[PDB]
Amino acid sequence: AEQVRQAGIDDIGGILELIHPLEEQGILRRSREQLEQEIGKFTIIEKDGLIIGCAALYPYSEERKAEMACVAIHPDYRDGNRGLLLLNYMKHRSKSENINQIFVLTTHSLHWFREQGFYEVGVDYLPGAKQGLYNFRKSKILALDL
Amino acid sequence: AEQVRQAGIDDIGGILELIHPLEEQGILRRSREQLEQEIGKFTIIEKDGLIIGCAALYPYSEERKAEMACVAIHPDYRDGNRGLLLLNYMKHRSKSENINQIFVLTTHSLHWFREQGFYEVGVDYLPGAKQGLYNFRKSKILALDL
């Protein structure tokens, strides 16, 4: 069959392959170490040992929201409802962690999202952590070693 | 004296007053309910019962980073090293939660940040959750009721 399951460390290589062409295309970038650190957030689809889909879920526990991000379907495996498969799996998983909304940040696929019952919200809806970033031009990221 | 301490629910009103003029100024917006949901992330400064400073810390546990955001000093209480007070308190607090870097997203105060040992990083440095947002124009936020 075809498996939808939470990702593990042996899946990083396969996730990277799905994501890399998205990064070149200006869509997403994730280093391997970054993926190692977040792996728990990722779900994939495996077909005959090939990773043909992934998606990440970032919970905002106290706001009871979660962002579904980094959703990729293998180019040879589109038009097989695989996006929907990941979403329904995400829906079901969020529900079981006391989360009652999923949100996405997208420039692509409005018709499809609307068709799933997604509605558009303003930046104020974003959980406070995710607010500093939506309102990003002359905007610098600064880090401090503790 | 003047107290630096983690915030509580009775501090929301006072935080809102510090933040509201920042929101009008295009800098930050936080509803009361949003602040109720995130209150645990906030630190304030209280002087004679007046909230004269606040700052939020958003931990990225597995990446061992945390974003310091929503930093406000009462307009009548500037040039009293209160920004530094909050930062050092944040530094100390992050350290004790196994976090070894603080980052900020800013358009303001480069000289000051550099002076504290902050250095500039690229968007790839951001913890994956915070990546979907930095790379935000024709970019929509969509929500789904589970």
Side-chain angles (χ1 to χ4, degrees), chain A residues 1-132 136-137 139-146, chain B residues 1-132 136-137 139-146:
Chain A
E2 182 176 301
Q3 290 175 21
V4 196
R5 62 169 176 65
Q6 225 255 254
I9 212 275
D10 301 337
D11 310 320
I12 307 307
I15 297 180
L16 287 177
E17 294 291 286
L18 276 183
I19 283 166
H20 283 177
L22 264 57
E23 294 172 355
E24 269 192 296
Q25 265 283 310
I27 305 175
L28 259 31
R29 95 167 33 77
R30 276 167 183 82
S31 71
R32 170 176 252 103
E33 179 188 317
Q34 251 158 23
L35 223 46
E36 297 173 335
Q37 286 167 15
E38 273 186 308
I39 197 61
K41 314 275 193 302
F42 272 84
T43 303
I44 80 267
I45 313 163
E46 171 265 308
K47 169 96 184 291
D48 287 358
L50 180 72
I51 285 157
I52 56 157
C54 62
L57 194 68
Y58 297 104
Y60 291 85
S61 196
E62 306 79 358
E63 298 81 3
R64 303 190 53 183
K65 300 171 181 163
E67 179 179 358
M68 178 175 176
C70 196
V71 181
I73 307 298
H74 191 288
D76 295 333
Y77 292 81
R78 326 291 321 261
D79 315 309
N81 306 120
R82 292 192 176 86
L84 185 48
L85 209 50
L86 281 164
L87 166 61
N88 284 158
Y89 176 105
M90 289 314 204
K91 289 174 72 177
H92 185 247
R93 178 175 200 78
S94 299
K95 269 190 296 152
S96 89
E97 285 161 10
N98 184 37
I99 281 154
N100 61 32
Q101 280 174 358
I102 295 196
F103 65 94
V104 299
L105 281 47
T106 185
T107 56
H108 51 274
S109 307
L110 254 104
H111 190 55
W112 189 82
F113 281 110
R114 172 151 305 108
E115 275 178 300
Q116 312 306 142
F118 278 86
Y119 55 93
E120 194 185 358
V121 296
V123 279
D124 295 3
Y125 162 102
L126 299 174
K130 235 274 202 270
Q131 259 163 21
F136 199 77
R137 46 187 270 151
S139 185
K140 316 216 170 307
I141 310 160
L142 308 181
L144 174 70
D145 295 346
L146 307 180
Chain B
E2 182 176 301
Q3 290 175 21
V4 196
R5 62 169 176 65
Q6 225 255 254
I9 212 275
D10 301 337
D11 310 320
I12 307 307
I15 297 180
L16 287 177
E17 294 291 286
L18 276 183
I19 283 166
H20 283 177
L22 264 57
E23 294 172 355
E24 269 192 296
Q25 265 283 310
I27 305 175
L28 259 31
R29 95 167 33 77
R30 276 167 183 82
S31 71
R32 170 176 252 103
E33 179 188 317
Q34 251 158 23
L35 223 46
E36 297 173 335
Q37 286 167 15
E38 273 186 308
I39 197 61
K41 314 275 193 302
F42 272 84
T43 303
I44 80 267
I45 313 163
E46 171 265 308
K47 169 96 184 291
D48 287 358
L50 180 72
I51 285 157
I52 56 157
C54 62
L57 194 68
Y58 297 104
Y60 291 85
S61 196
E62 306 79 358
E63 298 81 3
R64 303 190 53 183
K65 300 171 181 163
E67 179 179 358
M68 178 175 176
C70 196
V71 181
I73 307 298
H74 191 288
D76 295 333
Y77 292 81
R78 326 291 321 261
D79 315 309
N81 306 120
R82 292 192 176 86
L84 185 48
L85 209 50
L86 281 164
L87 166 61
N88 284 158
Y89 176 105
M90 289 314 204
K91 289 174 72 177
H92 185 247
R93 178 175 200 78
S94 299
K95 269 190 296 152
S96 89
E97 285 161 10
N98 184 37
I99 281 154
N100 61 32
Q101 280 174 358
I102 295 196
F103 65 94
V104 299
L105 281 47
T106 185
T107 56
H108 51 274
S109 307
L110 254 104
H111 190 55
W112 189 82
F113 281 110
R114 172 151 305 108
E115 275 178 300
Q116 312 306 142
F118 278 86
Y119 55 93
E120 194 185 358
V121 296
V123 279
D124 295 3
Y125 162 102
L126 299 174
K130 235 274 202 270
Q131 259 163 21
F136 199 77
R137 46 187 270 151
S139 185
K140 316 216 170 307
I141 310 160
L142 308 181
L144 174 70
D145 295 346
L146 307 180

